[PDB]
Amino acid sequence: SKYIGTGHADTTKWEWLVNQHRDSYCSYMGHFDLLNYFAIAENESKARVRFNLMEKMLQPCGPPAD
Amino acid sequence: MGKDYIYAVTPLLEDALMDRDLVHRQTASAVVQHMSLGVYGFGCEDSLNHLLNYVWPNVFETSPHVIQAVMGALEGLRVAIGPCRMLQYCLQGLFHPARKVRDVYWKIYNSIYIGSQDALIAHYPRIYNDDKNTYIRYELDYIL
Amino acid sequence: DMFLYNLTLQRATGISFAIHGNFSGTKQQEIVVSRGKILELLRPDPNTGKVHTLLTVEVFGVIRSLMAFRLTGGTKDYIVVGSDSGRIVILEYQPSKNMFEKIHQETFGKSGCRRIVPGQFLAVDPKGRAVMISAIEKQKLVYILNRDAAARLTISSPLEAHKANTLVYHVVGVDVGFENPMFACLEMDYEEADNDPTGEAAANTQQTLTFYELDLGLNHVVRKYSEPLEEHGNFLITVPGGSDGPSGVLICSENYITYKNFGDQPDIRCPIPRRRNDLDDPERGMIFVCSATHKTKSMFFFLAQTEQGDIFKITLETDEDMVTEIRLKYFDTVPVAAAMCVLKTGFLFVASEFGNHYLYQIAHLGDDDEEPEFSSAMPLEDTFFFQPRPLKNLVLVDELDSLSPILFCQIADLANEDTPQLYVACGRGPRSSLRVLRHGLEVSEMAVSELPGNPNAVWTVRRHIEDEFDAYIIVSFVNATLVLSIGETVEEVTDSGFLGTTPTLSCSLLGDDALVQVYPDGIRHIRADKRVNEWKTPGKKTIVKCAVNQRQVVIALTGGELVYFEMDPSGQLNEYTERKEMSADVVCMSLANVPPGEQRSRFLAVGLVDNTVRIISLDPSDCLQPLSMQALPAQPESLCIVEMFLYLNIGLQNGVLLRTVLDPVTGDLSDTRTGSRPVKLFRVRMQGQEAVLAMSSRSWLSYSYQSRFHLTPLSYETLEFASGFASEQCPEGIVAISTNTLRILALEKLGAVFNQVAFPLQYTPRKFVIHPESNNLIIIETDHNAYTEATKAQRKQQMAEEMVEAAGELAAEMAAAFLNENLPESIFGAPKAGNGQWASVIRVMNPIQGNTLDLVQLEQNEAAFSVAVCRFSNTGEDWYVLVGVAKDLILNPRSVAGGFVYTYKLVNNGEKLEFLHKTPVEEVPAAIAPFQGRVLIGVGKLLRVYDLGKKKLLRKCENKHIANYISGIQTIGHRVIVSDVQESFIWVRYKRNENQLIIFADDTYPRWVTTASLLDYDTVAGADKFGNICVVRLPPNTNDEVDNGASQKAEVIMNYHVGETVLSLQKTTLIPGGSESLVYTTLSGGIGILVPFTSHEDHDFFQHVEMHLRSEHPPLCGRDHLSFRSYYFPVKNVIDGDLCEQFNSMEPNKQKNVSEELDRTPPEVSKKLEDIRTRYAFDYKDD
Ligand SMILES: [K+]
């Protein structure tokens, strides 16, 4: 329960959804060569890729409901 | 070294694992755990899946000890079977309209989730987007 | 059960983290680079710069952080390494033991790079007394490095710094003056961003530069201060504090640079300057990537680098504690680096992220400039506009090679020697290139001089024996000879005395200064005093072969006639009495060089048309008499008596080899076969020792080496001659020829890896194919964010007009010099622009020479993806070129526009393309698979089947059951392999009687598929993004004739996490006369192979070796190894290679423990592991 990412009987799809986004991006930063994949894919530098990921850490999936 | 000696244990674990008594379910589930830890990376899965389909409907049971042995049983089946097939037998009634089955499937989901979250990255089911928010990780969809 | 055994051939050469220091403990300085999992130590050379690699060590894990320090008063730097699992290690070097001694581990978190688990960001204090680890969530731990009086590292308990809902961009600790230590961090809150329905807290929330404090006395971590920033921040330097310079951090960020001390300090901003005459979009900013503190006792200057290859010498100005000016000044322009280091006596190690790795020597110190210095003190609202410029300070010492990122490798033979070469198209941007890989011994290139004609044989023989320098280079043609002299500016010489209108068949030194040539009209003994003792040939006979010596001249005419000469103590010739004639002609002979002890050599091994090598003595007692003859399996071409006790070797008329000890009766042999082309045994000099450079299909080399034999090839294409060499250019080299060339080569190496040559390109090559008929290459090249040639041209001219439009005397022009130099995009960066911009270039190239054949350029926003030279069914025997094109890939978020397919006729023996027609398609084509004389195209979601029409393509058949999206496609001649992007491979059978596409087999396991190469009718050898090689077999229960996706399945036989990304699989045979091998190249520049076995006894042998080697010798960085390969999937049926090959490296008492634990001797174990590599891969040992 105190661990981050624990669900329970009221957690919704937006909460579960944004959680799996945030640890997704932490995993992207967590590897060492998938960044070389994204840097070879679209033409950037690795620091630009890291900064774009860290800026898209709090943005994505927008505002909540209501 | 009991990897070639699991087959005759399986119908033996069928009359064992079928629904008779608390000691059968509890201790036999602990046998599911210990077998599941003895075979780990050692070339045997489909036997254990045929175990797993008999393991799974036993979840809805009220006694705390036997549901605890079910929990550790599912943790052993997690570490031997893999995260994928656990989650595929998990996702069914996550959003079911009833709190009783929700406490169940959330509780199993947390016990899945604490153990090795980092393996879950590829095995997430992709869900396509609604109108208001973006749900597609294009990072998994770039093409050379 | 088809188990597999991993192995590797070329380690990954991609640098990601370079720290440095003194790990020898001495004054000398070494560089810890870091690859993906291969930690490696280096050493430069302070006299000629050659980076001699010293130690390389696998860690079998993920290297995520790497920081060095040194305790107070010590002189031996350490390394800290952060692991993927929640345990931190500390290492230490051993200059005599030659390994990494572990020191201590702590257990703090779970395994796998989670959110709340630390190990991500690692902070060290500059005094070595404290160290801090920190995730991108609440758990941040601080350790204390106490040293006792027992010279060890008494680490402490962990210190809790939990804090709900924060981020961290970066953490570097602060150079404080012997205080409660201070740790900096760029936090970011988001608990504001978790309640608002309108969602404005995605704005209006910025970094705080919070500082952290340890308390040594009271044993708790408290926070120092917290102050908001303005703009978002990448990496931070610690300014050197203490007693030299102030203590701060300077925050690089979006277009500005900002000092910010805590205190009463006012904060300077200064913007990053931009180039003169940009060719970009002004929307994109410019930030930094790396930083290099050059701490000297007197001063310090930085060198940081932009995106576009610009090093900035930031010369900080300040007060005692206040700051005054951050003035800026560029240093020069080098290619891009991701981390780099500065070494004492002025070395700079530019470590690129892509391609080669550099090493610069600082030639000019200080500030000696004429371009003006910038400042923050200047009033400007306009940023500073600086000049780009060539290489002026630095010099390139050496070019360290690398191969990453290997995109598309194909293993094939495109020449006339046996071994399949490795053609790899790899690179990045305009620095990309095409590279030819071979595997022989390290042939050092010395000289190139191409000549018209056909040299056959070219020696380099001294004039006088006392000299360590030789005399001449005798390039014998078919119709003449070219005589060269080593005057170190080597040209054609006249006074050599040879004057060869006839071809030279041997060059030898008979007298002390008397040279002997061998020519088809006789023998011309040439003293240094120009006297001619011309021997004439009786009759119309021609000399065929001869056998030279420092005191003996043995020749052979037609008819097997031996004519023996003798050197006197005076130095002249005496003919032997009896000319021994043979029954067959002489095809080859051999006579050794004379030892200095004796005056003559006895043996004379004479190969004949009779195929019987004959032993002939040359003593004056039994000169030209039979000793022992011995029949041979074939007809030799050359023979050579060599040393490393007397040795001889026999080369057959194909590239195979036997052995023969030099003796009146033969006793020892070991055969080697690695040949189809006849063998030429020519004399060389390998580090003061003679060997036999056997010339066959390849230039092979068998050598005794302290009775450690090796059959070894050269790392170069076909040659036909070798001899020794000595000059000022190369005092120990090899003179080699081939068809229409003249080269000096050299051999210096004992070790054995690939050695290469490279061909330049323009863009990042996506894929290429072989022409089958004329044997040529079809390169397609594609970039995002680029301008093509025409848009660059009229863009530059239009911007020139825009610089005439500036409203001012237009009394002089910038265009006169501005239209002169296009900067070479090789080194001067690239004008990156746009979001939906593209480019495309298609090229034909010949791999023998360097030159290119045809060039095609395309539309701006239309970029090429795939190609297959295919013939069609219903037309003639002619090959085409097909090219798919996509249109306007707004890639994130994915919205595309369309597609087109070209067609080129491929005429002129495949040496000139031409347009034929063009067809539209509504979606990106990603598949050109020829199939039954027609071409297949899988586009978007809908799989299609086309055929050629005289104006377009003519759509026949089409699937639409395929769920998500279609990436690649490969076919056996009946069945079709679909590479779905989320689901696994999909098997498709096509009804030829009905025109219908049928899906019959699927998977339950979604894998992110990239590539495949098939092996049979039922197994598909795939890959993955993350690094999971997988092979799935079709069960024979699958009904071929049928009408989640299928109730039937196809079961896994293998799951083996690699840890890097695999790109091009190809089953082949690397060495001639070998076996099957499924080669995986990978993304980080490495090459891995796979192995099938022989027996369950061998396999359970290696399995018990795994059972004991794992726990009885753990990995270095503490990664649980079965839980490392078992990362996503349970591993099925693979034996690791490099884990089981540490028996060559463990301690000898544990060699006793394990070798006696399995009851086997270490020569039996190590010989068993020699057998696998000598069997399949590039191992060179000769039985
Ligand atoms: K013959």
Short mmCIF file of N, CA and C in Angstrom, two decimals, chain C residues 543-593:
data_model
loop_
_atom_site.label_atom_id
_atom_site.label_comp_id
_atom_site.label_asym_id
_atom_site.label_seq_id
_atom_site.Cartn_x
_atom_site.Cartn_y
_atom_site.Cartn_z
N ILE C 543 65.46 -21.16 -68.18
CA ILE C 543 65.50 -21.49 -66.76
C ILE C 543 64.09 -21.39 -66.20
N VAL C 544 63.74 -22.33 -65.33
CA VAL C 544 62.40 -22.41 -64.75
C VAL C 544 62.42 -21.97 -63.29
N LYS C 545 63.16 -22.69 -62.45
CA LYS C 545 63.28 -22.36 -61.04
C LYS C 545 64.75 -22.39 -60.65
N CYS C 546 65.03 -21.87 -59.46
CA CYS C 546 66.38 -21.85 -58.92
C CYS C 546 66.30 -21.85 -57.40
N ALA C 547 67.44 -22.11 -56.77
CA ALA C 547 67.53 -22.22 -55.31
C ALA C 547 68.78 -21.47 -54.86
N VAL C 548 68.59 -20.33 -54.21
CA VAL C 548 69.68 -19.41 -53.95
C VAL C 548 70.18 -19.58 -52.52
N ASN C 549 71.38 -19.07 -52.27
CA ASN C 549 72.06 -19.15 -50.98
C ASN C 549 73.16 -18.10 -50.98
N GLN C 550 73.64 -17.77 -49.78
CA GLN C 550 74.70 -16.78 -49.65
C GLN C 550 76.05 -17.28 -50.14
N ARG C 551 76.22 -18.59 -50.35
CA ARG C 551 77.42 -19.12 -50.97
C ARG C 551 77.14 -20.13 -52.07
N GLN C 552 75.88 -20.42 -52.37
CA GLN C 552 75.53 -21.44 -53.34
C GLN C 552 74.48 -20.90 -54.30
N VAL C 553 74.64 -21.23 -55.58
CA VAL C 553 73.67 -20.87 -56.61
C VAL C 553 73.23 -22.17 -57.26
N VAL C 554 72.05 -22.65 -56.88
CA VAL C 554 71.46 -23.85 -57.46
C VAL C 554 70.37 -23.40 -58.41
N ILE C 555 70.44 -23.86 -59.66
CA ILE C 555 69.43 -23.51 -60.66
C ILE C 555 68.84 -24.77 -61.26
N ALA C 556 67.91 -24.60 -62.19
CA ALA C 556 67.29 -25.72 -62.89
C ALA C 556 66.78 -25.23 -64.23
N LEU C 557 67.23 -25.86 -65.31
CA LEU C 557 66.76 -25.54 -66.64
C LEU C 557 65.61 -26.49 -66.99
N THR C 558 65.19 -26.50 -68.25
CA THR C 558 64.22 -27.48 -68.70
C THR C 558 64.91 -28.83 -68.88
N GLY C 559 64.27 -29.88 -68.36
CA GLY C 559 64.82 -31.22 -68.40
C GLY C 559 65.29 -31.76 -67.06
N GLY C 560 65.04 -31.04 -65.96
CA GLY C 560 65.50 -31.48 -64.66
C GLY C 560 67.00 -31.37 -64.46
N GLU C 561 67.67 -30.53 -65.24
CA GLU C 561 69.12 -30.42 -65.19
C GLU C 561 69.53 -29.48 -64.06
N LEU C 562 70.31 -30.00 -63.12
CA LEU C 562 70.81 -29.20 -62.01
C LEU C 562 72.22 -28.70 -62.33
N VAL C 563 72.41 -27.39 -62.21
CA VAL C 563 73.71 -26.76 -62.39
C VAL C 563 74.06 -26.06 -61.08
N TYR C 564 75.09 -26.56 -60.40
CA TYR C 564 75.47 -26.07 -59.09
C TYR C 564 76.68 -25.15 -59.20
N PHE C 565 76.59 -23.99 -58.55
CA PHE C 565 77.70 -23.06 -58.45
C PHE C 565 78.22 -23.05 -57.01
N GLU C 566 79.42 -22.50 -56.85
CA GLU C 566 80.08 -22.48 -55.55
C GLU C 566 80.78 -21.14 -55.36
N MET C 567 80.60 -20.54 -54.19
CA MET C 567 81.33 -19.33 -53.85
C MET C 567 82.67 -19.69 -53.21
N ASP C 568 83.74 -19.08 -53.72
CA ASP C 568 85.06 -19.25 -53.15
C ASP C 568 85.22 -18.36 -51.93
N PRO C 569 86.29 -18.55 -51.14
CA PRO C 569 86.68 -17.50 -50.19
C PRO C 569 87.12 -16.20 -50.85
N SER C 570 87.51 -16.22 -52.13
CA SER C 570 87.77 -14.99 -52.87
C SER C 570 86.49 -14.29 -53.28
N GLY C 571 85.44 -15.05 -53.60
CA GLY C 571 84.15 -14.45 -53.89
C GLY C 571 83.65 -14.68 -55.31
N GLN C 572 84.29 -15.58 -56.05
CA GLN C 572 83.92 -15.85 -57.42
C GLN C 572 83.28 -17.24 -57.54
N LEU C 573 83.03 -17.66 -58.77
CA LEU C 573 82.22 -18.84 -59.06
C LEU C 573 83.09 -20.00 -59.51
N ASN C 574 82.75 -21.20 -59.04
CA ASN C 574 83.29 -22.44 -59.57
C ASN C 574 82.14 -23.40 -59.82
N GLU C 575 82.06 -23.91 -61.04
CA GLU C 575 80.99 -24.83 -61.41
C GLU C 575 81.31 -26.23 -60.90
N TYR C 576 80.28 -26.91 -60.39
CA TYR C 576 80.43 -28.29 -59.95
C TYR C 576 80.61 -29.21 -61.16
N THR C 577 81.24 -30.36 -60.91
CA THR C 577 81.67 -31.25 -61.98
C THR C 577 80.50 -31.93 -62.68
N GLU C 578 79.57 -32.51 -61.92
CA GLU C 578 78.52 -33.36 -62.47
C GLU C 578 77.19 -32.63 -62.44
N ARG C 579 76.61 -32.41 -63.61
CA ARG C 579 75.26 -31.84 -63.72
C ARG C 579 74.26 -32.99 -63.65
N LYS C 580 73.59 -33.12 -62.51
CA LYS C 580 72.64 -34.19 -62.29
C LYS C 580 71.31 -33.86 -62.97
N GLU C 581 70.94 -34.66 -63.96
CA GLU C 581 69.70 -34.47 -64.70
C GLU C 581 68.62 -35.38 -64.13
N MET C 582 67.37 -34.94 -64.27
CA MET C 582 66.22 -35.67 -63.74
C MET C 582 65.38 -36.23 -64.88
N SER C 583 64.40 -37.05 -64.50
CA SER C 583 63.47 -37.62 -65.47
C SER C 583 62.28 -36.72 -65.74
N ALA C 584 62.02 -35.74 -64.88
CA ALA C 584 60.92 -34.80 -65.06
C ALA C 584 61.45 -33.38 -64.91
N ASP C 585 60.63 -32.42 -65.33
CA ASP C 585 61.01 -31.02 -65.22
C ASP C 585 60.89 -30.56 -63.77
N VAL C 586 61.62 -29.50 -63.45
CA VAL C 586 61.66 -28.95 -62.10
C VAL C 586 60.57 -27.89 -61.97
N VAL C 587 59.61 -28.13 -61.08
CA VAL C 587 58.55 -27.16 -60.84
C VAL C 587 58.85 -26.25 -59.65
N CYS C 588 59.69 -26.68 -58.71
CA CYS C 588 60.01 -25.95 -57.49
C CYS C 588 61.19 -26.61 -56.80
N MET C 589 62.02 -25.80 -56.15
CA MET C 589 63.10 -26.29 -55.31
C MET C 589 63.14 -25.48 -54.03
N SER C 590 64.12 -25.78 -53.18
CA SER C 590 64.32 -25.07 -51.93
C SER C 590 65.73 -25.28 -51.43
N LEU C 591 66.41 -24.17 -51.14
CA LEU C 591 67.70 -24.19 -50.46
C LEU C 591 67.71 -23.09 -49.42
N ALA C 592 68.13 -23.43 -48.20
CA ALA C 592 68.08 -22.50 -47.09
C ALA C 592 69.17 -21.44 -47.21
N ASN C 593 69.00 -20.38 -46.43
CA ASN C 593 70.10 -19.46 -46.18
C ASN C 593 71.12 -20.14 -45.27
#
